[PDB]
Design a protein around this ligand. Structure first.
Ligand SMILES: Nc1ncnc2c1ncn2[C@@H]1O[C@H](COP(=O)(O)OP(=O)(O)O)[C@@H](O)[C@H]1O
Ligand SMILES: OC[C@@H]1O[C@@](O)(CO)[C@H](O)[C@H]1O
Length: 479
């Protein structure tokens, strides 16, 4: 009577196959990691790409581990990073390369679109923030730079639907992730004609976006039995918001991983002048609850400093960084220069040096710079979001792998002057499981699920410290 649901959660920095156990009467939700594997950017033939074949094999591995365990699997669901896509021919074979959002092929194309179509217009249609790597500009890059592929393309599937197709044989176009493309019209919940036209993409490459909960198809363990594959809120960030234990209207979330996604939930989008000027997005959510958020470059900066400096002990680095004075090195992480520079440490140091600031040179200094610069931006965005909706936030829920960074959790509380609740760590996985359970009729809605999470997950509270270094700094920048 307990249900066994599998989440496949693929991030930019890592992928995971996880198993969850749940039953209504007990209200208990347990997560088990089945298969953890690495994901990252591969330089392939002058492009920055994803190794989709290795991921699928890794996904199959994880699933086959659950079948051979002799576990009755009630459902499977896949969530990944947004924006990206895979092209398929008439037979199902991939067309072209699976290009990552970190690729430079889109450079300049966003500016061209705002010039040709109008900044206001694209925003009124999509309600999606302008990011230079949006699918709208990715498809322009493809149609302009590779026009010999066009005739072969029959279908375009976003990453999670691609992997759902590979397991089932059935194509899906999941709503919450479809919205990350800047190609869906916010008033119709279907693909925008004019935006598709500018991108050069064909409307027939896509089906009508469908809201989370439908069964895409089925997957077969090496013995026979059918396991339903559910279209979850397939955008990883959409899943993480679902699993965030939000306490009604005045709670904000920060989905913290490679990216920091800061926002709130609304039943109505914000597409006015204030939202455009602040560059807010209205990404699709479960239940039609718009995820009104902003992208913050996030721990991507730390990830890159780790590799380049050859640091294999992150907790040790964080512990040392805590001994260093706050807010002496400040950059703007959302600067385009940080999207994918060759030398991250040099970029961060160059940016500091340009502002006549002392140069962060040690490992701890570079981490200090990153954590402090993020926390100040967290503060800025939170003010921007509260000012937009005309309402304060009582608490900030930090979820994701980044929520294990207790230093950054406290810095964020202190800079934002707000109570921080950290947890759950694997929010995307949990939200993925959450939707499956509703499809199985084990769970009634998202509010139902968030109560399970808030009485199941480990939640750590961070109280904002007014006499903190970063708090001192933030009060100073007011007058
Ligand atoms: N033990 C830890 N302490 C502090 N931070 C951590 C720890 N483990 C992971 N992180 C942070 O979490 C990030 C990855 O989080 P995750 O939500 O998995 O991101 P993504 O889904 O983008 O891969 C890492 O960049 C790292 O900074
Ligand atoms: O797709 C690129 C970025 O990756 C995320 O999905 C988080 O992993 C963000 O929501 C999206 O803006």
């Amino acid at each position: 009577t307990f249900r066994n649901c599998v989440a496949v959660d693929l991030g930019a920095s890592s992928g995971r196959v996880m198993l969850a156990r749940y039953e209504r009467e007990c209200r208990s939700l347990t997560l088990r990691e089945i298969h953890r594997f690495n994901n990252g950017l591969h330089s392939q033939n002058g492009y920055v790409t994803w190794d989709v074949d290795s991921l699928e094999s890794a996904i199959r591995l994880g699933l086959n581990k659950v079948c051979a365990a002799g576990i009755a699997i009630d459902s499977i669901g896949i969530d990944t990073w947004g924006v990206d896509f895979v092209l398929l021919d008439q037979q199902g074979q991939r067309v072209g390369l699976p290009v990552a959002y970190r690729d430079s092929r889109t450079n300049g194309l966003m500016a061209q679109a705002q010039q040709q179509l109008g900044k206001r217009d694209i925003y009124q249609r999509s309600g999606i923030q302008f990011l230079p790597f949006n699918t709208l500009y990715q498809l322009r890059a493809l149609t302009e730079q590779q026009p010999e592929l066009i005739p072969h393309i029959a279908h375009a599937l976003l990453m999670p639907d691609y992997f759902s197709y590979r397991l089932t044989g059935k194509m899906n176009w999941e709503y919450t992730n479809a919205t990350t493309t800047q190609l869906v019209n916010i008033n119709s919940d279907d693909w925008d004609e004019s935006l598709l036209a500018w991108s050069g993409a064909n409307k027939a490459w896509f089906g009508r976006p469908t809201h989370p909960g439908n069964v895409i198809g089925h997957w077969i363990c090496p013995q026979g039995n059918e396991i339903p594959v559910v279209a979850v809120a397939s955008h990883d960030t959409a899943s993480a918001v679902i699993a965030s234990p939000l306490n009604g209207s005045r709670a904000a979330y920060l989905s913290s991983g490679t990216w920091s996604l800061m926002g709130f939930e609304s039943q109505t989008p914000f597409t006015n002048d204030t939202a455009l000027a602040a560059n807010i997005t209205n990404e699709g959510g479960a239940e039609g609850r718009y995820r009104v958020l902003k992208n913050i470059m996030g721990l991507w900066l730390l990830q890159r400093v780790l590799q380049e400096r050859q640091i294999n002990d992150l907790p040790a680095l964080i512990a040392a960084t805590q001994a260093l004075p706050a807010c002496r090195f400040i950059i703007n992480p959302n600067d385009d220069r940080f999207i994918n520079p060759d030398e991250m440490c040099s970029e961060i140091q160059a940016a500091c040096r340009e502002m006549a600031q002392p140069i962060p040179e040690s490992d701890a200094e570079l981490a200090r710079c990153i954590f402090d610069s993020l926390a100040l931006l967290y503060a800025d965005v939170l003010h921007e979001l509260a000012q937009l909706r005309g309402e304060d936030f009582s608490q900030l829920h930090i979820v994701g792998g980044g929520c294990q960074n207790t230093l950054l959790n406290q810095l964020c509380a202190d800079a934002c002057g707000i109570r921080v609740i950290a947890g759950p760590v694997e929010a995307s996985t949990l939200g993925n499981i959450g939707i499956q359970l509703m499809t199985l009729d084990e769970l009634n809605n998202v509010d139902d699920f968030r109560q399970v999470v808030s009485t199941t997950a480990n939640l750590t509270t961070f109280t904002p410290n007014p006499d903190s270094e970063i708090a001192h700094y933030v009060a100073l920048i007011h007058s």
